[PDB]
Design a protein around this ligand. Structure first.
Ligand SMILES: Nc1ccn([C@@H]2O[C@H](COP(=O)(O)OP(=O)(O)OP(=O)(O)O)[C@@H](O)[C@H]2O)c(=O)n1
Length: 204
């Protein structure tokens, strides 16, 4: 069976980088899936909220947890699966889909990857990325304006109304499940080195 690794942390904490850095240091086939690929398909009403930054994309229900469980389960079965593609500028699930063939190691990263116990138990290892909040906000802002076409005021309002409160209520609590908490994120090469070394040993 593949080796699943759950990676979590608040928004813009660097979960993706940490996943890339781990792959970089790890022959063993590896792939990185992201939980935000499974954002639920919004209604016309909901999508209207999102444009005004009045939608909670940080709540456990904002994710297609059902689809996540199935997809992850099949991967665990060694089957090759299809994965949805989410458009962050339109708040909509794209029509296209990505193929992901079997692998020896599978990293799944997202703000709420440890929330559901069903999904949480599929991970042979769980890591939590811890980054200062003002450092995180700063990145969320540059990324949102840049890569996701949004307005400064929309971002801060959404952050202050949904992201931060949701983080303290749903995200942070899941840290108690991590097997390894990584302060400073990807910059913590020592923590990441111990991790890739641990992964290698289990695969031997
Ligand atoms: N249509 C959507 C869907 C999600 N989000 C936001 O996307 C963030 C979660 O994704 P994030 O963890 O920040 O990005 P990653 O690349 O997965 O993490 P990192 O930057 O740490 O690699 C949530 O806070 C959510 O509010 C959004 O603005 N608009």
């Amino acid at each position: 069976e593949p080796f699943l690794i759950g990676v979590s942390g608040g928004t813009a904490s660097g979960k993706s980088s940490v996943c890339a850095k781990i792959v970089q240091l790890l022959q063993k086939q590896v792939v990185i899936l992201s939980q935000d690929s499974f954002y639920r398909v919004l209604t016309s009403e909901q999508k209207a909220k999102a444009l005004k930054g009045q939608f909670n994309f940080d709540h456990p229900d904002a994710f297609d947890n059902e689809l996540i469980l199935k997809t992850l389960k099949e991967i665990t079965e060694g089957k090759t699966v299809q994965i949805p593609v989410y458009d962050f500028v339109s708040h909509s699930r794209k029509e296209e889909t990505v193929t992901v063939y079997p692998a020896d190691v599978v990293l799944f990263e997202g703000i709420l990857a440890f929330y559901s116990q069903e999904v949480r138990d599929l991970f042979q290892m769980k890591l939590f990325v811890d980054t200062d909040a003002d450092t995180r906000l700063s990145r969320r802002v540059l990324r949102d304006i840049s890569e996701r076409g949004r307005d400064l005021e929309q971002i801060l309002s959404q952050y202050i109304t949904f992201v931060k409160p949701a983080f303290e209520e749903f995200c942070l609590p899941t840290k108690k499940y991590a097997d390894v908490i990584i302060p400073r994120g990807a910059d913590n090469l020592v923590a990441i080195n111990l991790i890739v070394q641990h992964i290698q040993d289990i695969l031997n």
